[PDB]
Amino acid sequence: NVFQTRAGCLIGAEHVNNSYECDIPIGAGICASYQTSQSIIAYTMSLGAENSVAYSNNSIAIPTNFTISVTTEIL
């Protein structure tokens, strides 16, 4: 049960194919987290759900409804 990464030798973590958000940062793009029965996994941190945009000469995407949100910024 050993994973080798560019930052060093990480023991105690199962290497995982699936990418998820980073919970704890390790180095060289590998992040660890505690998931399900549960154990510690390390993985290539997902940069998020990839996307792509239906670019065209001839279309627009104009929203029909919005939100009024509130977030907190703290200084």
């Binding site: 180095g27 793009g29 940069l47 990839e50 792509s52 945009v53 000469n57 995407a61 929203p63």
Partner: protein, 213 residues
């Protein structure tokens, strides 16, 4: 500049590398190490915080569609090159112009990772306008975007389209010029070179001090 080299230093090796008779004399100095080692560590995470808040301003990672019909605007130099690191041409030059207890921690966001951001931040910028900063990125054909972007400095859209081909050509030829300017003089990247240099100097000066009586 954005980030520094995430240097970390062990006081105990630096100050008493493998000497029991020494580290005993270092303990009498109380907590100078633990704070120094804590100080640089606080620097280290700050750099990763720098790179996250600089680049990762975007939640979803966009990728450009197979068609490049950018109203004549030619971005082939700035998009990542799929056949190489999925990095771009103009940036490829940029990585080419640059060059005891002392360890170098690696950056959390790897260079390949860094490129994807700069591909995404570039991708939504191209196909979606500014809307990808506010929320869901909305596809908009690029020639439309300039009509907005010209509307953003007080020249109505009728300038762009009535001058579409030239302006694209002007921007296209413009793009090539940086390639020459970057390729010609290494002084184009003076600031980043400095960021490396004083950092290189700091370490060297730090290293040399070991020779002083």
């Amino acid at each position: 500049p954005v980030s520094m080299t995430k240097t970390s230093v062990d006081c105990t090796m630096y100050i008493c590398g493998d000497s029991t008779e020494c580290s005993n004399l270092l303990l009498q100095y109380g907590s100078f190490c633990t704070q120094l080692n804590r100080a640089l560590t606080g620097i280290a995470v700050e750099q990763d915080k720098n790179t996250q808040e600089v680049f990762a301003q975007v939640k979803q990672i966009y990728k450009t569609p197979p068609i490049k019909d950018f109203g004549g605007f030619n971005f082939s130099q700035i998009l990542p090159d799929p056949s190489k690191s999925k990095r771009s041409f103009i940036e490829d030059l940029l990585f080419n112009k640059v060059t005891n207890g002392l360890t170098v921690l690696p950056p959390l966001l790897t260079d390949e990772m860094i490129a994807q951001y700069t591909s995404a931040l570039l991708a939504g910028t191209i196909t979606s306008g500014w809307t990808f900063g506010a929320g869901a990125a909305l596809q908009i054909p690029f020639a439309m975007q300039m009509a907005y972007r010209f509307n953003g400095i007080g020249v109505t859209q009728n300038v762009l389209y009535e001058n579409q081909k030239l302006i694209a050509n002007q921007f296209n030829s413009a793009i090539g010029k940086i390639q020459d300017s970057l390729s010609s003089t290494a002084s184009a990247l003076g600031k980043l070179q400095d960021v490396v240099n004083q950092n290189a100097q700091a370490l060297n000066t730090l290293v040399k001090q070991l020779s002083s009586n």
